[PDB]
Amino acid sequence: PGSMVELHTNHGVIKLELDEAKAPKTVENFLNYVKKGHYDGTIFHRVINGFMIQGGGFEPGLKQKPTDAPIANEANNGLKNDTYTIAMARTNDPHSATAQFFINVNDNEFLNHSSPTPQGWGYAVFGKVVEGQDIVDKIKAVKTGSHQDVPNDDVVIEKAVVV
């Protein structure tokens, strides 16, 4: 019964179920970007098979879309970075997440919160893919640069919508 978002990519729809009970600020922030139209015309700019696919920040040509103020890290919510979960990207600053997200395509234990420290904070999970797992599986396997991890052919989020 979480909020639902569809990412309409150029490879098909990825449908997300979000967990606002466990990640309230993170889900609010994500839905704000969806409703603002932020993700529309962004790409998955970092694709690493066996690891994760990251997007929602850059337009084709790697032009970064402006974002709003960063949010606090909710990675202490107990949700793990397991296959098909969605989490927030960030810099080494734990409280730096804005728009960019990633979908885990493995059980990425090393991304999980252990403590509220610079090394331990981890990456905040706020939902999971409930339909279009096959689309995620296709995206993770595209050819990428060695340019490093950037898909040779753009993987575009054409529209993100709340459903």
Automatic annotation (TrEMBL):
<comment type="function">
    <text>PPIases accelerate the folding of proteins. It catalyzes the cis-trans isomerization of proline imidic peptide bonds in oligopeptides.</text>
</comment>
<dbReference type="InterPro" id="IPR029000">
    <property type="entry name" value="Cyclophilin-like_dom_sf"/>
</dbReference>
<feature type="domain" description="PPIase cyclophilin-type">
    <location>
        <begin position="4"/>
        <end position="162"/>
    </location>
</feature>
<keyword id="KW-0413">Isomerase</keyword>
<dbReference type="Pfam" id="PF00160">
    <property type="entry name" value="Pro_isomerase"/>
</dbReference>
<dbReference type="InterPro" id="IPR024936">
    <property type="entry name" value="Cyclophilin-type_PPIase"/>
</dbReference>
<protein>
    <recommendedName>
        <fullName>Peptidyl-prolyl cis-trans isomerase</fullName>
        <ecNumber>5.2.1.8</ecNumber>
    </recommendedName>
</protein>
<dbReference type="InterPro" id="IPR044665">
    <property type="entry name" value="E_coli_cyclophilin_A-like"/>
</dbReference>
<dbReference type="InterPro" id="IPR020892">
    <property type="entry name" value="Cyclophilin-type_PPIase_CS"/>
</dbReference>
<dbReference type="GO" id="GO:0003755">
    <property type="term" value="F:peptidyl-prolyl cis-trans isomerase activity"/>
</dbReference>
<dbReference type="GO" id="GO:0006457">
    <property type="term" value="P:protein folding"/>
</dbReference>
<keyword id="KW-0963">Cytoplasm</keyword>
<keyword id="KW-0697">Rotamase</keyword>
<dbReference type="GO" id="GO:0005737">
    <property type="term" value="C:cytoplasm"/>
</dbReference>
<comment type="similarity">
    <text>Belongs to the cyclophilin-type PPIase family.</text>
</comment>
<dbReference type="InterPro" id="IPR002130">
    <property type="entry name" value="Cyclophilin-type_PPIase_dom"/>
</dbReference>
